[PDB]
Symmetry: none
Subunit: 27 residues, 3 copies
């Protein structure tokens, strides 16, 4: 009989940067 | 014979915060 | 023998929004 499944792979890569923040307040 | 490949790993970590927003109005 | 390792997981989620921008001009 073949062996059992291998171990899980490693975690994935990091996600992308988030969106830009909001505008600053009025001058 | 070896067994089958294991399952995928879990998702990676979140990305970094985004860039700063634009300047406010005058 | 156990099988080979699984593949890397999926990418993480996006990071959160960046900080507010600076105040507007005078």
């Amino acid at each position: 009989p073949p062996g059992p499944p291998g171990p899980p792979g490693p975690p994935g890569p990091p996600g992308p940067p988030g969106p830009p923040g909001p505008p600053g307040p009025p001058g």
